[PDB]
């Protein structure tokens, strides 16, 4: 049923421009960003793939793989990738899932009310253990911000490492900038231990 | 049932720090950003409200109102707002919906699998006619990027005005920068009319 | 539910390379051949479209329109048609229905057990009053015989005109060649009236 | 439920002019063409049986057996076969399934909407492993083209042998005649390996 | 649901060697004997039709029409009737219902457990108002006694005329021969009125 | 389903200002008073907590623990407790259950018809074996009488010790004051044994 | 279904020691206390009726009527009342509802898990408009505190008059004694208007 | 469903030795005793009919009709009645309902667990308005007491006339003999009006 | 489900003026008469208990125990028994089942349509093996005839001893007085053996 933050990504086998892929598991110690686009040979989706491929190594340096998805035939994916390689001079280095009929698209709630024929601009961020960490549904008509996906992976990974929480617009928070936040105390014992620290006992910040 | 892009925002009456509000309709020619946060007096949600209130007038200049939401009592909202006004020196100028029991939260799919006691960081963007235009589910542990919400409203509004589509990372697209994209042709007549224009017949760009 | 010989073709509105089309009715005094192919840019489907477009005027002279269908996006149809026009030097003159998600494909039983991602090579022959007259399911891996579709329309139309029935391999039947067959008698009165005519009372042939 | 291309032919035992027959299995390394006709002693069905029996050895040389079927009593089959042997001077050498009540006919979707009392002209092509390979529903009023059934078996068998796909109207394709087609590449690696071959990378042809 | 003695014969339209017939009503002031036989060109059913046609005028003199029924095609009926006319030298003067698929046969409970492909030897006697008066199910393997059907119509008609009841083996009852029986008294008043008449008060006989 | 007098308190794990607590069992030889209040930082609920904390040791001397509950976040509980400690000069020494979403509140029937957003003033008295002994639903708008809860525990405990029953307003009954009542006789043997004692045989009193 | 605070008391007609009574309505501008007891001639229930009848005029001075209820026959009620009048020297002046079978008892959730044969000590307080204002379930074995029921009516009535809320143990609150509490502010406008008043902005007290 | 005391006797039409009878209504101002017996020509049932017919006029003088019932054919009833008239010298003057199949017997719960083939000795007493007043199920093996049925009608009729209640074994009660009893008082007003009359206020007796 | 003649009395445990009783079994070699009355302190039920207690030893001499039942509390039973002992000068020597809520009363079909608050005057006669032998439903308003219950036990016991059947009004049958009846013959062999005995072969009488 549509997956949510905290649930494990559903077991499913998909057919991609790089062969078959077994989806939560073939990426079982990496993060990955599964993202949909309406269709191949549309212009906005092309700018998005250009941007992803140009920024691919920042995705690799954060140990995440990209994997796209659309309701177009896997031959059309190959012809789209070939057009991109030769007109925009960049090679799309990640797999694109072909799902006509939209079975995996419906399973992840990627078909909305405004088109019955194509996905929206969905983005799932799955971590190294396969849990769904972040969900974005952008509409057809505006492209996504790829640097915001990177910013979110950095923050999500820092959370797993340092057991902290990132502030808003991190690492550019207008109150504490680069600094991260201590997870608020759970009992009254723990809370009193942090009294008189800057801001308040529930709002304490460190640096990393 | 959980609303999706294109559907009208569900009729519902809510109780907020500014009184009662009738939700899709009291904002019937403005845009608004309905957004949830886990709970009052948590630190990350505080940085998010600080950032929203500091950037409030850019939201106003785009004709959108902000409206928050959490499973906390409306008295706790008032005490949170008062703490923010006097420690961070800024007045929270938008209403905060109080929903304990989580009835409106469950109706908008804001409760996920990782906490049974609080919303995630959901963001809905509703337009001047009440249709849901954009949906974001950020997890509890990372704060949101508020400038990305603004960027998306700008783009969504430009789409409604000029009947165009924005490229990725607009207005900073690595192929066409500020320029917007012509919606691809629908029939074979229309497609041939655009042959030999830069990129290809489905990928044509103008300026605004 | 899957249509059958004698039933009226189901009311449905489809989106094609020639715009919108209202399917049983926009062809309300013509015959038409609705036919599916697995996907654009596959090789066998290309030879089939070449053959159809080269033989288009024999279809027109029998008052039938062609209309194709596949689970590919309508932009991919336009790009396929453009590739055909410029590599094989022929212009595809009939509409191609775009149905991703496969809603109209499932409704006509065009998805079989051997691929979950594409139609088979289905062929429906609908007459001037919209009734389904003939159904062919060819598999993905062999192309269709287009002259056999023409042969069947000729025969089906002669049946409607002369109230006869065509023999096997007509107009090349190894017993009576060009000649057509009288519909066998229904009662015992009618049967005795035809006794001692060549072959037998149920097997009588004329010429047209 | 009505069988489709790729599914195995349903297990069923039938009573024929040659005794009992166990249907998918008694033909377990041969191909066979199961085909229905409306009824014995109708004229068009007679021309079809004449044509099948005259062409029987081309069916045998392709390792396929013929087997007919109708809602008529098995005594009426024998009397029809005897009439054919002595008026048209040819012996019907294949079994004819007798199914009054129409149980096997309904199971294979051979009864349509235009007669509640007889089958249509259905044709199933089953291969040496029992999978349904091709389905034809011709109406009562036009006879079938038997040479087209042979053409389809030849092509289907060549596909199983050479792992190719036949073009339209094969072996008489107006682009490549006798030549068969290479199955289009599945991944982007495989596609680039075939660049600059005649037609395009998805449309490559050999000879056999 | 299977008709029973006293119920009206179900409305149904059937297709016979004499054209269409509307079954309970086209015989709306006559009696008729609807009877099934397994199939045309079987030997026992032939002797039964011979016997019926030879005795046809005794059926006519009792104001009853005969009408047969089998799961064989109406062309096979005509060919059976023609074989009978020329080998046994008698013309079958009554209609034979053709019902392949067996829809009317199943509706009258004429298909039993010993053959799934043919009716048994059912006999229904319907009167001038359409009520089912008598039901016989003889098996495939023994022919019927036609003089017993006549004997039963005579008795059933005498019952309707004289308000009596016929004894066993009438008109040859081993106690009272030709004589018929008075319907036994219903109340104790009526019973005492008949005391001391021959046999007893419930068993009184007259002559006609 | 809503618990009742005599049933065991439902197994449930709750999150409180003192950590996790496993509810019927962590108190498995003590009594406890589970009680709800509408919300933190409301005035009447504050007076109730003041009164409970001031009288805490009378609760301890009767071997009962207090444990509160509200639909407010556990951080808001801590901030409420801190406000009480420093304005009313008393430390709240018992755990407060945090249940937003109201799952445990709905399970104990603590949400009524007059507010859909907060509990009423429910009071459950559970004994040393975990059975529900007494249930009070006070409305939002009047505070509870805490000395009446103590009076009821004293009486309930005396019942368990001496196998008696307390009179009305005990220990201040206007007929027998401090004295307790003998449980009325169950059979007619037992009843006659108590005849002519003061009041009557069903109404006998002792002292403790 | 079991009534709750805020719901209107269910329409029902009952048979009492004072005749028939139509329950929510015959008391349509008075308050009333409907209360159950296990059974007549039990000792604790007797002390409770004594106490109620002795304090009857304080109930009358607060415009409330008393009405009792038990699963005992209405003749047994009369004999119990007569025993009370002559042994305890007081006349029971209020009606007692007789409900054997327990239909009204089950409808108000007065039968619990510890006896399948008698009610518990339930107490409902209904106001002049028929809404259920307060619910008490005391167990069989301890009698009720009648002065606490009076205290609650006084408070509930003061709430309806002065739009206030009573503190805990009112009119004997250990913080503000006789004084009542202002209902906490609902919006942030209203809250700031009360800043710097004693205790805090949500905790303000007046006198009556 | 099985009728009970107070319900109206179910509408039903029955076939009896006196013709058709419409059961609750043809007796619409008389009382009647509907009674079953296992079967005709059993010995105990014969003694019961003898006794009923001999006492018939006491039944008539109380304005009640008798009507019997058994699962035996109505001819067997007539032959049983005739045997009784001539061996026991008495004429059975009441109707006997014939119900083979037992449809009316099952509807009145007259078939029990000890025989699946015959009724028990059921007795229903219906009054002048058709309500069921008294139900007796005697077993097969003991005959009924007919004078007790008369005694019960006398008492039931006296109740309807004088609004009283008869004592046990009336008119031979060992405490008050012929005298009848006043229906006990319903309210406490009415009860006190009868104090100090003989026996007690609920036990008062008059004479008729 | 409501018990019937021949079924075993349902297992059930009941609470009576003599303690607990396990109902079919604690009487496992005695007969017993379970009988209901509407309520204690009603006048007719009192006369019935007087009569039962005065005749108790005739019940004991037939090896049957009495046991009563009503929807009144077991304390009210004791007070009723005490009133009877001292006003009517007789001690009620049998147990009275207390069933408020009416669970055992509904299980035995003792609540009818004329009062929803009390049983009717039901009488069950159970034998030494626990089978239900006789069922009486007398209405509220007439008392029962206790000598008729005794008469029925005598007859039922004689049946078990001598394998006979008692005539009507036995031992005072107007045809054969004291004499009992031979159970009618079951087969035609047995019947002829009794021909020419007084009355007839099915009606033979002996003496005991």
Author numbering:
A (entry chain C), B (entry chain D), C (entry chain F), D (entry chain E), E (entry chain H), F (entry chain A), ...: 5 to 212
What does the paper say about this structure?
Archaeal Prxs belong to one of two subfamilies, BCP/PrxQ or Prx6, with the latter subfamily typically being 1-Cys Prxs that are characterized by a peroxidatic cysteine residue (CP), which is the sole redox-active cysteine, and thus lacking the resolving cysteine (CR) that is present in 2-Cys Prxs and forms a disulfide bond to the oxidized CP. Besides peroxidase activity, archaeal 1-Cys Prxs are moonlighting enzymes that also have a chaperone activity, thereby protecting proteins and DNA from damage caused by oxidative and thermal stress.
In contrast, no structural information was available about this Prx enzyme in Sulfolobus spp. Here, we describe the crystallization and structure determination of 1-Cys SiPrx from S. islandicus, a highly conserved homolog (95% sequence identity) of Bcp2 from the closely related S. solfataricus. For TkPrx, it has been shown that two C-terminal cysteines are responsible for a redox-dependent switch between a dimeric and a higher oligomeric state, with the former mainly functioning as a peroxidase and the latter mainly performing a molecular chaperone function. Intriguingly, while these C-terminal cysteines are highly conserved in all other archaeal 1-Cys Prxs, the Sulfolobus Prx6-subfamily 1-Cys Prx proteins lack both of them and only have a single cysteine that is the CP, thus evoking questions about its oligomeric state. The quaternary structure of 1-Cys SiPrx is similar to those of PhPrx and ApPrx. In this structure, 21% of the total accessible surface area of a monomer is buried upon dimerization. In contrast to the ApPrx structure, in which citrate was present in the active site, the H2O2-binding pocket of 1-Cys SiPrx was found to be empty. Taking into account the monomeric molecular weight of 24.7 kDa, we conclude that 1-Cys SiPrx mainly exists in a decameric oligomeric form corresponding to the quaternary structure observed in the crystal structure, and that a smaller population exists of a higher-order oligomer, which is probably a 20-subunit protein. Both cysteines are highly conserved in the archaeal enzymes and contribute to the redox-dependent association of dimers into higher-order oligomers.
